Design an enzyme around this catalytic site. Structure first.
Site, PDB file in Angstrom:
ATOM      1  N   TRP A  59      12.004   9.430  -0.637  1.00  0.00           N
ATOM      2  CA  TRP A  59      12.011   9.015  -2.030  1.00  0.00           C
ATOM      3  C   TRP A  59      11.194  10.008  -2.863  1.00  0.00           C
ATOM      4  O   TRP A  59      10.000  10.214  -2.551  1.00  0.00           O
ATOM      5  CB  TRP A  59      11.340   7.661  -2.111  1.00  0.00           C
ATOM      6  CG  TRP A  59      11.469   6.921  -3.408  1.00  0.00           C
ATOM      7  CD1 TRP A  59      12.620   6.651  -4.123  1.00  0.00           C
ATOM      8  CD2 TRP A  59      10.401   6.238  -4.082  1.00  0.00           C
ATOM      9  NE1 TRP A  59      12.318   5.849  -5.211  1.00  0.00           N
ATOM     10  CE2 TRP A  59      10.962   5.596  -5.213  1.00  0.00           C
ATOM     11  CE3 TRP A  59       9.029   6.097  -3.828  1.00  0.00           C
ATOM     12  CZ2 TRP A  59      10.184   4.843  -6.106  1.00  0.00           C
ATOM     13  CZ3 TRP A  59       8.247   5.336  -4.728  1.00  0.00           C
ATOM     14  CH2 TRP A  59       8.831   4.736  -5.846  1.00  0.00           C
ATOM     15  N   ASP A 108       6.863   2.393   4.580  1.00  0.00           N
ATOM     16  CA  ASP A 108       7.304   1.984   3.249  1.00  0.00           C
ATOM     17  C   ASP A 108       8.423   0.985   3.447  1.00  0.00           C
ATOM     18  O   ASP A 108       9.461   1.307   4.039  1.00  0.00           O
ATOM     19  CB  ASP A 108       7.800   3.191   2.450  1.00  0.00           C
ATOM     20  CG  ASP A 108       8.197   2.855   1.014  1.00  0.00           C
ATOM     21  OD1 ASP A 108       8.564   1.685   0.717  1.00  0.00           O
ATOM     22  OD2 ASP A 108       8.211   3.795   0.169  1.00  0.00           O
ATOM     23  N   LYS A 142      12.934  -5.572  -4.965  1.00  0.00           N
ATOM     24  CA  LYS A 142      14.363  -5.626  -4.721  1.00  0.00           C
ATOM     25  C   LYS A 142      14.773  -6.923  -4.038  1.00  0.00           C
ATOM     26  O   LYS A 142      15.698  -7.587  -4.484  1.00  0.00           O
ATOM     27  CB  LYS A 142      14.817  -4.423  -3.909  1.00  0.00           C
ATOM     28  CG  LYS A 142      14.732  -3.101  -4.695  1.00  0.00           C
ATOM     29  CD  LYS A 142      13.561  -2.310  -4.291  1.00  0.00           C
ATOM     30  CE  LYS A 142      13.741  -0.847  -4.699  1.00  0.00           C
ATOM     31  NZ  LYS A 142      13.950  -0.604  -6.156  1.00  0.00           N
TER      32      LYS A 142
HETATM   33  C1  LIG Z   1      12.231   3.736  -0.924  1.00  0.00           C
HETATM   34  C2  LIG Z   1      11.342   3.007  -1.890  1.00  0.00           C
HETATM   35  N1  LIG Z   1       9.979   3.030  -1.721  1.00  0.00           N
HETATM   36  C3  LIG Z   1       9.158   2.364  -2.591  1.00  0.00           C
HETATM   37  C4  LIG Z   1       9.699   1.669  -3.656  1.00  0.00           C
HETATM   38  C5  LIG Z   1       8.757   0.953  -4.594  1.00  0.00           C
HETATM   39  O1  LIG Z   1       9.319   0.528  -5.812  1.00  0.00           O
HETATM   40  P1  LIG Z   1       8.383  -0.474  -6.633  1.00  0.00           P
HETATM   41  O2  LIG Z   1       7.210   0.287  -7.182  1.00  0.00           O
HETATM   42  O3  LIG Z   1       9.139  -1.184  -7.723  1.00  0.00           O
HETATM   43  O4  LIG Z   1       7.888  -1.480  -5.632  1.00  0.00           O
HETATM   44  C6  LIG Z   1      11.067   1.628  -3.847  1.00  0.00           C
HETATM   45  C7  LIG Z   1      11.548   1.209  -5.204  1.00  0.00           C
HETATM   46  O5  LIG Z   1      11.907   2.077  -5.981  1.00  0.00           O
HETATM   47  C8  LIG Z   1      11.897   2.306  -2.954  1.00  0.00           C
HETATM   48  O6  LIG Z   1      13.251   2.297  -3.107  1.00  0.00           O
END
Ligand SMILES: Cc1ncc(COP(=O)(O)O)c(C=O)c1O
Ligand SMILES: Cc1ncc(COP(=O)(O)O)c(C=O)c1O
Lengths: 426, 426
Positions: B134, B220, B256
């Protein structure tokens, strides 16, 4: 054989932990005078009537108030509402395209992003704290600057002799003698922990020094509404500096004035001088700065929390709710003032010894905001906790007047009389 | 003459900004396939029925669900809810006192605090990212470690030739060759952006390497419920590693799976090996680690945001709502699968040329999670945006399947056919 073996226990936060120890205390007569959190006449948390109404609106329409990621800088309506409360409706600065605004995680989160913003852009600017300040200012500073690599500096605030007064002649000398283009952290009003503020006259004397030296004013504004009860008035020093062209940052919390503590809602603003050569160029610079703030946030918590933003934007943009909100803040301020008169009268009635050369408790009456810097010693604080179940902040004997009620003021006066009778001031 | 003169504009986030652009687009046939955010049958934000129920509960009594500062680590019911979901009910790790849990600002805020936690505690440990990951991971990393002073390392993830398969032979060599006690960032399931995961068999091969080398696994975990559609199964890798005595962190997002994107609600866990000599000593170590996380947070945003925590805990501790929640997440996974089939069918019917050596679109069907790493080129992605108002991530042509509907799939396929016919694959 764990990679974590010997991990150190960090002591709990000297202020926040008071509520924890308090909640655990089984003494029915316990009193919480620690954390600056409003309490009603019964000593209980209070949802502002404007916030109760906002909740009814936003909880009734989850299609409109949905749970998707917000824009990175925050909802426009929230940002407009924040600017409105801090700078006034359609201010000069806004008209000129000078305000760069970005939602953050209440006061603390706005300080963190604001401090980093300045440390990244002007890494050699000296950063000045008042000589008495909110203890978490030191922690936030450390994580961004590293106190060991880049020590903060200090300007004179209270007298070095202990007495509850600003040694303003030295304040002026410190700001004047500092290097040009230094950053000065200022509390906008209700200085925490001292409860002693620059008067209007004194802010006006600071103004030309700030201008001549091209210093940046960094305002921490968490008590707008709690100094005079008037929003407009409590923004005096911020709006005066901006109107005169002093370049400023504002960390604006809605924890205390909207009672949205746990929602973690506030706004960071940067207001530049407006000298880019056109309104459009001013707006471009403002936008550039918001883009820097959002990039910082992106790498820290992605974007900020919606629920508190919804509550604030719903209130400020409804004429009925905004007036209710103003009245609710006036009401909290008035109860605090009542508790000041009552605790004082109960101490006077007992002829209870006091701190300082004067040895009186009149400072309870004159403190600005939620607290009194009581002058009770660390020994007094421990004793009041252990013998009487009365929870104060150890440093300065800081007292949150919001925990006092008509039912407990005389109990608090009695405990203090006992503490000070058994351990007189030096 | 402003101190801010010349401040540079940072370009908008390449993923988040896709929603901004899509929202401004006046073309009624526009399709948002950018940010991974669930959408219903009509392409609209979807409040989970379990979340709708929770909202009604918490919005009805604001004395119970008050707005005071939460405990610094988060509400115990929330922390219990978070541990339950990730590790299971009364896990062996919990029973042994091995889990240190602290609420944080969703996934991102959990990564921030967890990255900093390790960089502070083990400054000499190398940190290894998968070779595709990511994008924001690099930025979260840069703000904590400083990319230029302390670069991250990589382990092999996808094959050199660009094909959507993990070069697992090299994955193992890379993890085996790293210095002992290194840190490896892993996606728990639904690897973002590739949609290709280690299989259970592959995870089981990594286990002894991790044990032998005494590496730390940093998971993660944002997509539990979207990989196999079962919470239990989607936490396989995390639970297996912990049960085997691998020391792990987990950054756990509820953006999510609960659809709480904007509430900013998640949890950070550190699970130590539990070799301190007793359950009580294990718990003392865990608490010390929690104490460090909360000190970090204190200096950053004070404490975390209550509203999402309330929703999660209310759902998880009510048997009916938890079951409803599980059904709701399955419904989301099911719609995504139906859209994978529909888009694939619509491409197959047009004999639309595909990327890669095979030139097919089958990887639409087999991708795990919300996305397809389509392999459309940056030229294709820009063309789809300008000519067809379809918004994809430029990197890899990552497509959020959640933006597809019965009404728009054939449109998306016609557009892809047009882009790929005009701009053939090299
Ligand atoms: C792969 C991944 N890691 C971490 C996150 C953390 O997103 P958020 O800050 O909304 O929890 C997400 C969301 O975008 C994600 O898809
Ligand atoms: C002077 C001052 N600054 C900042 C804060 C930050 O509080 P919060 O993070 O809830 O906005 C507070 C209150 O705690 C404060 O009193």
């Amino acid at each position: 054989m764990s990679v974590f073996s010997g991990f150190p226990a960090s002591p709990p936060d000297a202020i926040l932990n008071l509520t924890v120890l308090y909640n655990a205390d089984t003494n029915p007569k316990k009193v919480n005078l620690g954390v600056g959190a409003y309490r009603d006449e019964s000593g209980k948390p209070w949802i502002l009537p404007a916030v109760k109404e906002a909740e009814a609106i936003i909880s009734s329409d989850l299609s409109k108030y949905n749970k998707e990621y917000p824009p990175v800088a925050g909802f426009p309506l929230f940002l407009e509402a924040a600017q409105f409360l801090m700078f006034g409706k359609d201010s000069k600065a806004a008209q000129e395209g000078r305000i760069a605004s970005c939602q953050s995680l209440s006061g603390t989160g706005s300080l963190h992003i604001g401090f980093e913003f300045l440390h990244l852009w002007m890494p050699k600017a000296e950063f000045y704290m008042p000589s008495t300040t909110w203890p978490n200012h030191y922690g936030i500073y450390d994580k961004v600057f590293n106190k060991l690599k880049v020590p903060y500096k200090e300007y004179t605030y209270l007298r070095k002799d202990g007495e509850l007064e600003i040694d303003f002649s030295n304040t002026k000398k410190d700001i004047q003698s500092a290097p040009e283009k230094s950053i000065f952290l200022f509390h906008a009003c209700a200085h925490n922990p001292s409860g002693i503020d620059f008067t209007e006259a004194q802010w006006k004397e600071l103004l030309p020094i700030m201008k001549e030296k091209k210093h940046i004013a960094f305002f921490d504004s968490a008590y707008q509404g709690f100094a005079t009860g008037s929003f407009e008035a409590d923004a005096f020093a911020v709006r005066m500096f901006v109107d005169a062209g002093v370049e400023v940052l504002v960390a604006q919390s809605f924890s205390k004035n909207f009672g949205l503590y746990g929602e973690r809602i506030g706004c960071l603003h940067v207001v530049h001088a407006g000298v880019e050569g056109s309104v459009e160029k001013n707006k471009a610079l403002s936008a550039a700065m918001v883009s820097g703030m959002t990039l910082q946030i992106r790498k820290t918590w992605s974007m900020s929390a919606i629920h508190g933003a919804y509550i604030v934007q719903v209130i400020v943009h409804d004429k009925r709710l905004l007036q209710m909100f103003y009245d609710n803040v006036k009401e909290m301020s008035a109860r605090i003032h009542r508790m000041r008169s009552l605790l004082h009268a109960s101490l006077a009635k007992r002829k209870t010894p006091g701190p300082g050369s004067k040895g009186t408790w009149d400072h309870i009456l004159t403190a600005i905001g939620m607290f009194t810097f009581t002058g009770l010693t660390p020994e007094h604080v421990d004793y009041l906790k252990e013998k009487w179940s009365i929870y104060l902040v150890k440093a300065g004997g800081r007292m949150s007047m919001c925990g006092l009620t008509e039912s407990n003021c005389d109990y608090v006066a009695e405990a203090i009389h006992d503490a000070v009778t058994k351990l007189p001031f030096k």
